[PDB]
């Protein structure tokens, strides 16, 4: 039962034009298995774009490979990206956590978030007027990676509580 392609996917942004099929393939296998893997180029001039996509086995392969990064591939540093739920990556570090209510408190979400990536900032919202708690709050981390991990899973259970979670702006 293999996990969803599109989930098993990175896109590499930033690569040198003279990145071919297989230096690329070379470079990513060395964090698992490769299914796929193609750098785009024009259909006419055959020039590279200056990206392209590998596909991972499974999604721990993907997870090593993002966290190996800085990528120098032939030389250059490129840009992988994970896909997330019209084509373009809202790439952004910062997560809305709702419906967490008045119980739920900082070492709650730190104590979840924190195997997704590294947190820089944990905000629980509290009312303007009485202080008490909205039962909503931001966390931000180091690295966009982490958002991407968080929003593609279906469920987040934090201090019991079934949590929605998207990418703030
Ligand atoms: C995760 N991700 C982000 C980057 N991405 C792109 N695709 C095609 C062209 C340019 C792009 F930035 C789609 C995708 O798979």
Redesign the pocket.
């Known amino acids: 039962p293999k996990e969803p392609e599109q989930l098993r996917?990175?896109?590499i942004?930033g690569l040198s034009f003279e990145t071919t099929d297989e230096s690329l393939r070379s470079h990513f296998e060395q964090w698992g298995t490769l299914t796929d893997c193609v750098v785009?180029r024009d259909p006419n001039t055959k020039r590279s774009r200056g990206?392209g996509?590998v596909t991972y086995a499974t999604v721990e392969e993907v997870d090593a490979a993002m966290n190996a990064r800085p990528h120098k591939v032939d030389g250059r540093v490129v840009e992988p990206?994970?896909?997330?739920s019209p084509?373009?990556?809202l790439?952004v570090k910062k997560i809305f956590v709702g419906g967490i209510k008045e119980d739920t408190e900082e070492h709650h979400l730190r104590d979840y978030f924190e195997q997704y990536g590294k947190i820089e900032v944990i905000e629980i919202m509290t009312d303007r007027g009485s202080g008490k708690k909205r039962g909503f709050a931001f966390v931000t981390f180091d690295d966009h990676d982490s958002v991407?991990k968080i929003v593609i899973q279906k469920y987040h259970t934090v201090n019991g509580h079934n949590c929605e979670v998207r990418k703030a702006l």
């Open positions: 996917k990175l896109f942004g785009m990206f996509f990206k994970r896909a997330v084509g373009a990556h790439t991407d």
